């Protein structure tokens, strides 16, 4: 029935957890970071973080603790998945090969049991005698640690307290004891219990203390020295050691809640505290050396340190360095200084780590303008709020820029016969040549005895016999090095000027109109081996020596003027070996011979921005598999260079492109630069492994980014972005936003910091009177509609909404016969006393210019969660209703029809006269607008209940849905159109567990397509709470089946990190049902195929009947699958 | 334990920021009162009151007649589409979970108990809930501010002369 594909375009960036210890080696400080499904391992050092190994798991990491059982050389790792997959991991490294082996594993799920609020707690005993798991209320799961229990057997000790807040094991306890915080009728208390592995019960423990603060939320076991625990709350931080009891109440807390903490000293003394607003604190414990015997805890104080990103995770490394793991904003590496500098902060950020999550909304846009998408998102929240621009391409780091206009070419050069680095850069101009010398980082004019400067150079560089060559329009000059001077020169027999110039280390082929001359480079002499007259004006030349040959090309690639041809010629005799008649109007600009992986090709570029590429046989010289792409519009110049190992071609033009090979398939990658007229590799000591680039006015040296990667441009907002549109005509984006302002005695509400809405250029406030018939300390939400510039992204205009009015939906569009393009917002009057809005409105603005204009207004009796432009009309959902409004000539929106069969219509998507509705709990429904009738008709709905979160239309018959339990699904309109009941239903044909919470779906692609053919159809990108960006397409039953087989084979061979089965992981799953995936294939699995050994590769293919298209079956080879998957990787 | 839920939009909002749903929690929606106590905000209430006229509301389960009212059906086990009104479905759950079957909610514009004339001129929303395993049914209707709130569930008439006939919540009821 259904055939979909799902690949990760961007791995989750939000940090869910981060622990620290000695995992890689007992004498190494490791930093383990949990994204969601990703596990990153580092080594802490001087520079700080050294990436060691990164892996994935088939599940969401919920618990992650390092620990050390007696008898282990280094630490072991504990991990519990959200689907309850448990395991103990060991870091084992033999050679350049690293593996994370499994010492034990099992699924600790219970058949019944209520998942506790405050979720899964996973703690480990200090003695390493056992693991404690609070998975369900009233139950505490225990797992013994005998090197015997590898299947992770466990028992459930009952717990009276049915509502635990937090739990930790205590230190210095002959018997493992649990100290937690709970809440019953009497309030919140904190008791203890001992855990006996023997009897398998829980007795009664050391101490008890009823009624701690009502907001007591964290527990902390203080180490050996002090023993006992600490309890963090709202203004209440207390110590409890049986008989001891301390209690401070720093007003510094009061403001925000302390959510995370970390022990700085192995003994207690210092701890880090994390505020919910980003405040970093320090908790100190004053140790009192009695005089003789033992040591008590005299006192404890709190000290503000500074501001960081809103922290989720907090880990102290060493030498005053701390890693701040964020979920709402970028994560960071911070240094704690002894002295609080200006303003008063010991906190100074070192490194900032991009985080796109949460992604609340997004839109695809061709900003730069030319067939390449780009994602603009509403990421983060609160103070960490922001916009992100995500683009594909290769990046270059500019290292110098000189104002040299008119550069007509440039070549790298070795001035010192002995040194192997470049130290000179030759520049060409209309009629001269200028030689720049390279001193470290300094570049300055210089002369080179043998070279002429009053002529244009067509080529120059190092050649055979410690010689140097310079070919100008006037002649080709051979220059000595150590002796240094002109030691030979060639010129056409009649002084005619050289028109085209090709040249490698030992040979030269220049053209004088139609005349071709083959010369060879020998000591102190240039030898003219031959010559010929081409049937037409020569346009371009290449004699690049390919193959294991030795600097002597047997072939000569030439491009002609008249018949717009590219032809191969045997070098000695200029004998024709192949004449490829191409293009038609424009002549070839550039032509080059090169090798990409193992194969040789011929590239030829027209003045069209058009590029032809053939397979080349360097023996026979015949061109094969003629292909064509469009790299732009200006003529294109081809040049070769070697990034790291391999070698690629740099294509200079208005659309700069790096051409290379992946798995035998060429790759055209766009460079993130404006326009490049000429390029050349430059490898000096000052500019190691670099590129010398040149446009129409400036020289520029920098270095290429190895290979392509999404680049993330970010725009701070300092407040929460909620929705976003794009208005072409206005050249800008419309963004819904909210900020936190607290009530103030001075009549209204102030704020907490400057933000995009406040520090705006223009500004305005709602003047509406439609409605008008907290304490002080309470927080209040204020919404705004920002108008950000497409190019500068500065906030042009900001607009405030009525007090208490939340803006929930946005949309840029035209309506009726109205010529103008408005910005339309849907809202809701939110009062805490109501369970759901009863009032709201649809405001219609316009940014005709300079400022925003409030054109119209329309009252509504509920929240306008979603709205979409619909065939000139405006579709919108209010609460339980779906309404279609018309736009008169009198500029008013007026109801035509409605649909009321919903609990709460949150999401809306349109295609034609069909409409897709996403409801709180009645999953998707399909409506159709009946024109003649003037209202709506229910076509079909999904009869399975589903708490939606996002929705999308893959095509007329298939609808994609994201649900609140991290699952994706597809519903289809039954094909058995033989009954009005069968059409009424839409079968769930696709089920897949994503393990990601989805907020937005939107047709689009971050990949080019103007490049002159896809195994997939469609392209829906999607945003995630973890900052993860995915893609979804459609396959033919053919490909699906192959890939489904592929998966099952691969699963037999891929070593799964925690011994978790891929099929378990991808099984649709909720607190209700659990089913096997179907209709879905994850390309993450399929793409991991290209990363295993041929042996394993050959095993995966073993005994597989494969159809290479020949319709004639054959035994499948690894290369068949390589070709298949390589094609698949190109959809993103 | 009983906690007051959170206005939908507050839930809508924060869920796009934090993947956590927040469902699993013994909450009662804001503005609703647990009209059951024979002899948060629950409120103790008299079983009945023959003092004021008014036809009783038939048991929900019995799936009988009550026309000016809205019917809600909720299946705790999933497998069947829920139907009715947001609040109907919300209370149905909170109702099954706690042993409660009567609920009241008086709109914003309204100043213990003594409802009658002083508090008349509007409508007060009632809720009746039935069990039957995993299957939970609810009948919801509108009552005059005039009216008395009791454990018994009837459709009282009006004592005040100001109390209205249809509200904007009383429509589409059948
Ligand atoms: Zn009345
Ligand atoms: Zn009513």
Curated annotation (Swiss-Prot), chain B:
Q: Share an example GO biological-process annotation for this protein.
A: symbiont-mediated suppression of host cytoplasmic pattern recognition receptor signaling pathway via inhibition of MDA-5 activity
Q: Which subcellular locations apply to this protein? A: Host cytoplasm
Claim: Metal-binding is one of the keywords in the record: yes
Q: Which cellular component, as a GO term, is one annotated location?
A: host cell cytoplasm
UniProt KW keywords: Host cytoplasm, Host-virus interaction, Inhibition of host innate immune response by virus, Inhibition of host interferon signaling pathway by virus, Inhibition of host MDA5 by virus, Inhibition of host RLR pathway by virus, Inhibition of host STAT1 by virus, Interferon antiviral system evasion, Metal-binding, RNA-binding, Ubl conjugation pathway, Viral immunoevasion, Zinc
Protease: present as a keyword of the record? no
Coiled-coil spans in chain:
none
Positions binding Zn(2+) 2 in this chain are 146, 158, 160, 163
Supply one GO molecular-function term. Answer: RNA binding
Which residues are listed for Zn(2+) 1 binding in this entry? Answer: 123, 142, 167, 170
Query: Its family?
Result: Belongs to the paramyxoviruses V protein family.
Q: How does it assemble?
A: Interacts with host DDB1, STAT2 and IFIH1/MDA5. Interacts with host RIGI regulatory protein (via CARDs domain) and host TRIM25 (via SPRY domain); these interactions prevent TRIM25-mediated ubiquitination of RIG-I and disrupts downstream RIG-I signaling.
Biological function: Plays an essential role in the inhibition of host immune response. Prevents the establishment of cellular antiviral state by blocking interferon-alpha/beta (IFN-alpha/beta) production and signaling pathway. Interacts with host IFIH1/MDA5 and DHX58/LGP2 to inhibit the transduction pathway involved in the activation of IFN-beta promoter, thus protecting the virus against cell antiviral state. Efficiently blocks type I IFN signaling following infection by behaving as a substrate receptor for CUL4-DDB1 E3 ligase complex and targeting host STAT1 for proteasomal degradation.
Write the protein's name: Non-structural protein V
- What is the originating organism of this protein? Parainfluenza virus 5 (strain W3)
Q: What is the lineage of its organism?
A: Viruses, Riboviria, Orthornavirae, Negarnaviricota, Haploviricotina
Its gene is: P/V
